[PDB]
Amino acid sequence: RALRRLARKIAHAVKKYG
């Protein structure tokens, strides 16, 4: 339902890690 704050850390972490 609310993946605004969830997808945030996910995408970011993935954009930072690799």
mmCIF file of C-alpha atoms in Angstrom:
data_model
loop_
_atom_site.group_PDB
_atom_site.id
_atom_site.type_symbol
_atom_site.label_atom_id
_atom_site.label_comp_id
_atom_site.label_asym_id
_atom_site.label_seq_id
_atom_site.Cartn_x
_atom_site.Cartn_y
_atom_site.Cartn_z
ATOM 1 C CA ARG A 1 0.000 0.000 0.000
ATOM 2 C CA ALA A 2 2.537 2.581 1.174
ATOM 3 C CA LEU A 3 5.920 1.898 -0.423
ATOM 4 C CA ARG A 4 7.015 5.540 -0.479
ATOM 5 C CA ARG A 5 9.265 5.290 2.578
ATOM 6 C CA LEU A 6 10.082 1.613 2.037
ATOM 7 C CA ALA A 7 11.054 1.725 -1.638
ATOM 8 C CA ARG A 8 13.036 4.847 -0.749
ATOM 9 C CA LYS A 9 15.635 3.134 1.437
ATOM 10 C CA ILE A 10 15.597 0.140 -0.909
ATOM 11 C CA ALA A 11 16.266 2.043 -4.133
ATOM 12 C CA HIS A 12 18.798 4.308 -2.422
ATOM 13 C CA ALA A 13 20.662 1.430 -0.777
ATOM 14 C CA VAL A 14 20.780 -0.315 -4.154
ATOM 15 C CA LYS A 15 21.917 2.891 -5.855
ATOM 16 C CA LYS A 16 24.691 3.241 -3.276
ATOM 17 C CA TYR A 17 25.814 -0.356 -2.758
ATOM 18 C CA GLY A 18 25.817 -1.303 -6.429
#
